[PDB]
Amino acid sequence: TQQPIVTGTSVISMKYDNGVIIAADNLGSYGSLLRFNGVERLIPVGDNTVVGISGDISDMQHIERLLKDLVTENAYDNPLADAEEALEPSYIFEYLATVMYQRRSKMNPLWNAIIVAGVQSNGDQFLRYVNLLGVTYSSPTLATGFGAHMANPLLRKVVDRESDIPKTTVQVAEEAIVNAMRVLYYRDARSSRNFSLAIIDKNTGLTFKKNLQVENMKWDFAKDIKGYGTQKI
């Protein structure tokens, strides 16, 4: 892809004492047009990984097909594919990063930003980020697009360093994620009120919540704003 067409906006994610949380809206934007509502931008790989993709939706569907084929080809000649030697978040992220960097070096990038979150087999939280340039990095809080500018401050207020992760319950992290999504819907022009959220825990498993809505909207004060300076009525 040399220019994105149908795109999806920010994808946010954070860590907590027992796993990871990742959210993304359900909108496919055709430029300035909010064309496609209901686009699931969270792709659950297996029962232990979730990939959140922002950017060109065609490349995101290509990534979906590649991940499903990776799962299928891992199941080949692997009697433990449902136990040991199963696809880990680290394996999925490394495959994705290899693909992204090779496409970048081939001058035909995958115009996306990908956040791979999950729980390793040893209970450790995996949460990393890659983009169309092949840049890979990880942090207790990750976000793409506008979320990297607005959602990341609110998420770092909850988890600023690694030591804060064991102190963060799943409720606190989910509340922070929902607050960040609300602020994004406030200030992002290519955003949607409906979104999807996923909580990967080392004790509960893959928790996939669809059709969530941004609530508790503060708009009353808008009735008092009049004019653009000197206007009184």
Place this chain on the structure above:
Amino acid sequence: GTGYDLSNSVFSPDGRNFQVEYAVKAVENGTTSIGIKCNDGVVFAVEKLITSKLLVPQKNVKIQVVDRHIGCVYSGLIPDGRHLVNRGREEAASFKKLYKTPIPIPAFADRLGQYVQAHTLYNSVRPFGVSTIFGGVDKNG
């Protein structure tokens, strides 16, 4: 004349390809493998010879999977069976990439049949030494 069984894909005066029949003989010398088509699906079974108790039980899997719905077992030269299974996996992957839907069982059967028949078309390639029982469930049952 004579010597019709020395090269593959050579028609004998009685209208036969003896290399294919020799591959069939190689198949007959292999372990037993069966398949049963029931009402809602299929079942595959195979016998694994324990030449020594040094073989780790439950390992050395003989039944292979193609896509997520195709099961394949084979009797004969196990490596040729693995080769055929890899070819079928490539065919199923291309079919899913192009037509979205998982490959139907008759389509997979015809793909494997065309592959083996092409392998019985040239003297520069040896016929497959396997008989393959495969199947699964598709939109037609």
